[PDB]
Amino acid sequence: STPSHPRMPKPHVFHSHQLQPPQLQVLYEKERMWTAKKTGYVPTMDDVKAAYGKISDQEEQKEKLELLKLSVNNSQPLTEEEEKMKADWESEGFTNWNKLEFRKFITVSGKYGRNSIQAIARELAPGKTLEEVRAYAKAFWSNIERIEDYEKYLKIIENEEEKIKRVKMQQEALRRKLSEYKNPFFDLKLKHPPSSNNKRTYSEEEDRFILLMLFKYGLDRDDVYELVRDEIRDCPLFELDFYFRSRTPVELARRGNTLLQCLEKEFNAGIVLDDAT
């Protein structure tokens, strides 16, 4: 009826490193060559050039004379004792993760940190339940060394952790600084923070106020300064402090980070949390 030469050349089944038996490739290149023999396939250039990828000359025909013979004397598919290996090997592999899904895991771990399983296992629910996001998580680090790309991976994950730890540091650093004053709204004076290379548009009293409010609502992941903006307006004290009143959550958060950073440059001598449990 119609030839169409039905014969699978030498297809592969190994994408990027999704954590799976690195020796399976060999086990596959046995039945992958058998699926060509049983259907009668002729080894050409499309195979050899895609099996070594080199523009050779006199020693190029050897490969074509090799891949051909390997398929000719390719014994029956993996022995019955070797077949029981298939399942076992690939059962260990988490190749059941879409590249798109995987690339999200190595991202959510950023703004959520290393071991925040729940925090990340919730912002997706792709393949299956949390157990999946935990199993692959443990498997990830425990056997990460087998990386295909860690340059812009293990760094974009770690780097975000630094920022998180810095914010959580500024938070805790603020806490102790307030516990250092009976009435903070007056006696609070920064040791190192006092700047000069820039115009102090904000009142010294104001800076003190916006800090008392940062302590009031902490420094959560998202919305924070929009509350300070409200708190400022709510207070009848700055009822005529037009500049203060006119500070938008954005152009106000600016001063906030500036103060936190400057506060950081003060209480950075007691940021060594004793880890001797």
Binding site: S116, R229, R233, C235, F238, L240, R245
Partner: protein, 592 residues
């Protein structure tokens, strides 16, 4: 031979109005007189006027002459009630009967005050919204808010602007007044109130780096708007109608909410505050939160001395020439302009000290201020005799209306429109010199209310109010917890010149130095008829207060005449266009 200079000691009539002054819990109310009445909305109304003033360049003319009362009459407000606005007005010092404005005055006179407010309401809107696509190239002064827009034969008058606001209203943050509170009691805005996982973390997923940055997600409940069921901002009546649609008290809320939103979104004024908060020169006394003129705390008699001292110090500033042989002999253009005057200024003080014979210390000042100025140019760029209300450096955080603060009592204010701008011929907002001189002309009857109508006197706030701020209370209340929602810190002391005198007579009972420590000897759960509080300076602690009280009795005694004329001015000439031809006949009319 050693000069000396201290800039902070001789500020340009701008001492730092710090908040630490009353850092001690000291709040009293032994001032309960028939004239003193609580005014909850006073604060917002003040801010509303202060905003107009500081940006009078952006607003209409008819908006920058509003009397505090014009707001009351306009929004149907009434002093007294600690809650919102009183039921009415207390007719006379003795009647105990209340009545509303439509009874007090005339209707056309009321619709007038109402129109003003709507203009103010529309002007604010356009100022933040319809005026955001600006493309200046030098200076803008054309596109404003015409008095015609308000009186337009259309419906989209307020309909359009409000439509925009209703969209941004959410993010821009609603005022406490209208915010949907959470009576739930189970949740509080400050702390968190919603866990995501009933269990956090325990079995580490990467033992190599045991950290766990995010134990579990919390969700917060921030300031949310009132339901459409009762949200004033979505009052359908307001569209076709005006601002009067909302409740009298609400009206104030909105106008305040705007005066803030505008300050944070009006591409025009927000870029303006920047131009005022980014001066290439910083105030010698640093950048404090609040600023007031020198005399408003030092006092007239104390500020004149500060200038005498200043002159005595700037005299030594030149008589310390260690090597004047370099300046005197060698004649170079650039350093000689100063040297030349260094001889005249000296041969002038000698042309007074030796040419007066203890005549009067008046000529030892009134005829020196003009020639001293060129001297200050260099050493102290600022002195306690320059017009505070005429320096872009202090303008913003500066606080007009401020009359002074008395220890263990609080601050005192007085709403008076149009501080800086044009035709400030009559405005009380000037240097201590011209000011004390201007008031002195009304005290001696040299200047009649007529002269006001002649010198754009109607461009000013005709009617007036004298308020008192309980700063001490507020200061502390805010120092602890922000449970200010519902408290009162503003108090009216008088509404007209008449009652102003009653307050000055009442002010005597406090300025008095307690000497009566004996018995009267006159022989033949809390109830107070009106007022019987006189003792104030019990201990020697309140001694500092007795003075700051008296100095206030001074300003108010001199401010009396000029204010009585402003009143009479509106009574006679009701915002009447002077003209040209008619402007003369009124002068030779001789109205007796």
């Amino acid at each position: 031979v050693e000069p000396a200079l201290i800039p902070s000691n001789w500020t340009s009539v701008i001492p730092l109005l710090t908040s630490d002054f009353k850092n001690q819990y000291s709040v009293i109310s032994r001032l309960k007189n028939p004239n003193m009445k609580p005014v909850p909305y006073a604060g917002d109304i003040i801010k509303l006027m202060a905003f107009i003033n500081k940006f009078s360049s952006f607003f209409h003319s008819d908006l920058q002459n509003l009397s505090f009362q014009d707001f009351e009459v306009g929004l149907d407000l009434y002093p007294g009630d600690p809650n919102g606005s009183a039921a009415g007005i207390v007719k006379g010092p003795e009647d105990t009967s209340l009545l509303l404005y439509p009874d007090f005055m005339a209707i056309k006179d009321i619709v007038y005050c109402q129109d003003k407010m709507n203009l103010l309401f529309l002007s604010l809107l356009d100022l933040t919204f319809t005026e955001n696509f600006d493309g200046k190239s030098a200076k803008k002064k054309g596109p404003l808010t015409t008095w015609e827009n308000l009186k337009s034969s259309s419906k989209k008058v307020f309909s359009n602007p409000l439509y925009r606001l209703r969209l941004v209203a959410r993010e821009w943050g609603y005022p406490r007044e209208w915010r949907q509170q959470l009576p739930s009691d189970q949740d509080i805005s400050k702390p968190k109130t919603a866990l995501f996982e009933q269990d956090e973390q325990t079995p580490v997923v990467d033992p190599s780096h045991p950290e766990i940055l995010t134990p579990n997600i919390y969700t917060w409940n921030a300031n949310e708007p009132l339901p459409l069921e009762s949200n004033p901002l979505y009052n359908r009546e307001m569209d076709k109608n005006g601002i009067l649609a909302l409740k009298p008290m609400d009206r104030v809320v909105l106008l305040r909410a705007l005066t803030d939103w505008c300050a944070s979104h009006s591409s025009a004024i927000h870029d303006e505050i920047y131009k005022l908060t980014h001066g290439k020169k910083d105030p010698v006394f640093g950048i404090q939160t609040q600023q007031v003129p020198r005399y408003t705390i030092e006092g007239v008699d104390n500020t004149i001395n500060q200038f005498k001292k200043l002159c005595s110090l700037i005299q030594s500033r030149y008589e310390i020439r260690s090597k004047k042989k370099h300046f005197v002999k060698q004649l170079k253009e650039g350093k000689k302009p100063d040297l030349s005057r260094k001889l005249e200024i000296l041969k002038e003080i000698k042309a007074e000290l030796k040419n007066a014979v203890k005549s009067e210390k008046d000529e030892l000042l009134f005829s020196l201020y003009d020639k001293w100025v060129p001297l200050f140019e260099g050493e102290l760029p600022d002195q306690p005799l320059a017009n505070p209300f005429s320096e872009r450096l202090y303008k913003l955080r500066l606080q007009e209306f401020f009359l002074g603060r008395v220890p263990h009592i609080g601050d005192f204010y007085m709403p008076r429109l149009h501080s800086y701008g044009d035709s400030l011929e009559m405005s009380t907002f000037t240097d201590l010199r011209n000011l004390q001189a201007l008031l002195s002309k009304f005290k001696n009857n040299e200047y009649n209310a007529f002269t006001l109508f002649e010198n754009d006197g109607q461009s000013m706030s005709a009617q007036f109010k004298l308020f008192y701020h309980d700063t001490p209370s507020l200061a502390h209340d805010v120092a602890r917890g922000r449970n200010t929602s519902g408290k009162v810190y503003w108090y009216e002391l008088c509404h007209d010149s008449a009652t102003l005198l009653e307050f000055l007579e009442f002010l005597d009972y406090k300025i008095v130095k307690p000497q009566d420590e004996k018995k009267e000897g006159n022989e033949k759960t809390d109830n107070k008829p009106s007022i019987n509080t006189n003792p104030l300076p019990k201990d020697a602690k309140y001694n500092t207060a007795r003075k700051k009280l008296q100095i206030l009795k001074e300003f108010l005694s001199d401010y009396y005449f000029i204010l009585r004329q402003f009143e009479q001015m509106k009574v006679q000439f009701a915002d009447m266009k002077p003209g040209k031809r008619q402007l003369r006949r009124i002068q030779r009319q001789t109205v007796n």
